[PDB]
Design a protein that fits this description.
Elements (H helix, E strand, L loop, with lengths): L19 H10 L4 H6 L37 H25 L2 H16 L11 H18 L9 H18 L12 H16 L3 H15 L18 H20 L15 H13 L25 H10 L21 H5 L3
Helix pairs in contact: 3-4, 3-5, 4-6, 5-6, 5-7, 6-7, 7-8, 7-9, 8-9, 9-10, 9-11
The chain binds a molecule of 3 linked components (GCU-MAV-MAW).
């Protein structure tokens, strides 16, 4: 690819994106404050519950509107996207339960679900020019994050785990083989493809994929403005602040994942700008929305900046590592986001 980390190697395929053993221990012995307590997943008998089935044949995400970008809604849209969002929610929940309890039963449930999708060759047949391309990057990563926490679990069908891992590896290699257009080549989608390749590169011990993934993080650092804003996200009008925050989600996971492999991505800078510059801009723009006026004149949609929104999951990981202050008071209720490993409060928050 040609970047400072084009020779990086996958050191340990079972390292995951957090220290599972150590975190489980803290959750089982330590004294959890009210916030952490509220984040504990509720146990359930997953062995007798069926999960979403994969679409058969070609993967097609219907258009949201019968025609154009607005107006009459397409009734086929809701049922199809829900199928994927349920798949992602269940995958992340089982991953989080396995971390918190350590019970092999949750790993068995996850594998049974994923084996169903692998056998059907899901997330592989689609038009790369359609919405399906984006749906794949989110769903493959979500399942990969959950599975990465149980790569060292001995009490599970090992042949089944191998089949699933090969499947995810195929899914990621195919999805990232497409370049994307003038924006999707290099905006937050590039970073989502980045976290997908990184976590799957690690569990499938595929150094080439792992390297390609780290390369998206590098690409992003060079697309940061003097004030910490992302070049491509500041072109989204009333959604500019939303996308600035959104891009922080996958970039944070690539860095957290790389860190468990002995690589310090967070320390990587380009022209006096790094990921911290981006974090500081998000916090400053939420306090003073006038800063966005240099890029867009429209009033900003701030739906993502409410306590409890999954969009804030990246703050739990970064705060746990760097210890900066919660300036905006966002970290009150627990946060859960399937696409960035489930509950960051459960997996990283340390009172
Ligand atoms: O995370 C929440 O707590 C949150 C609560 C809400 O009431 C909604 O259910 C909200 O939905 C999210 C959803 O979880 C995804 O994050 C979705 O992601 C979209 C991105 O925001 C971009 O628009 C991207 O281009 O498309 C993504 C997609 O289509 O999945 O955003 C919604 C939302 O913000 O409404 O979650």
């Amino acid at each position: 690819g040609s970047h400072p980390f084009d020779q990086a190697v996958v050191k340990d395929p079972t390292a995951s994106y957090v220290d599972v053993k150590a975190r489980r221990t803290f959750l089982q012995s330590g004294q959890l404050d009210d916030r952490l307590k509220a984040a504990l997943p509720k146990e359930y008998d997953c062995t007798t519950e069926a999960t979403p089935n994969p679409q058969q044949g070609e993967m097609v995400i219907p258009r949201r509107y019968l025609s154009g970008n607005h107006g009459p809604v397409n009734p086929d849209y809701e049922p199809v996207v829900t199928l994927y969002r349920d798949f992602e929610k269940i995958s992340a929940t089982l991953g989080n339960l396995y971390v918190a309890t350590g019970k092999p039963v949750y790993a068995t449930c996850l594998l049974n679900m994923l084996d169903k999708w692998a056998k059907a060759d899901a997330l592989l047949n689609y038009d790369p020019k359609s919405q399906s391309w984006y749906q794949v990057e989110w769903s493959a990563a979500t399942a990969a994050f959950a599975l990465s926490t149980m790569m060292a679990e001995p009490n599970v069908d090992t042949a089944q785990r191998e089949r699933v891992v090969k499947w995810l590896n195929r899914v990621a290699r195919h999805q990232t083989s497409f370049p994307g257009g003038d924006t999707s080549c290099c905006n937050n989608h590039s970073y989502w493809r980045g976290q997908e390749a990184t976590i799957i590169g690690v569990i499938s011990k595929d150094d080439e994929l792992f390297r390609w993934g780290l390369g998206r993080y590098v690409q992003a650092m060079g697309l940061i403005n003097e004030d910490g804003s992302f070049v491509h996200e500041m072109t989204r009008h009333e959604q500019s602040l939303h996308y600035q925050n959104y891009a922080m989600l996958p970039l944070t996971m690539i860095a957290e994942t790389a860190s468990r492999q002995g690589i310090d991505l967070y320390a990587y800078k380009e022209n006096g700008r790094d990921i911290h510059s981006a974090r500081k801009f998000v916090f400053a723009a939420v306090k003073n929305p006038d800063l966005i006026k240099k890029y867009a004149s429209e009033p900003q949609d701030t739906r993502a900046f409410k306590p409890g929104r999954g969009d804030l999951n990246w703050i739990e990981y970064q705060r746990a590592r760097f210890g900066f202050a919660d300036e905006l008071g966002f970290m009150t209720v627990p946060i859960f986001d399937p696409r960035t490993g489930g509950s960051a409060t459960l997996l990283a928050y340390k009172p």
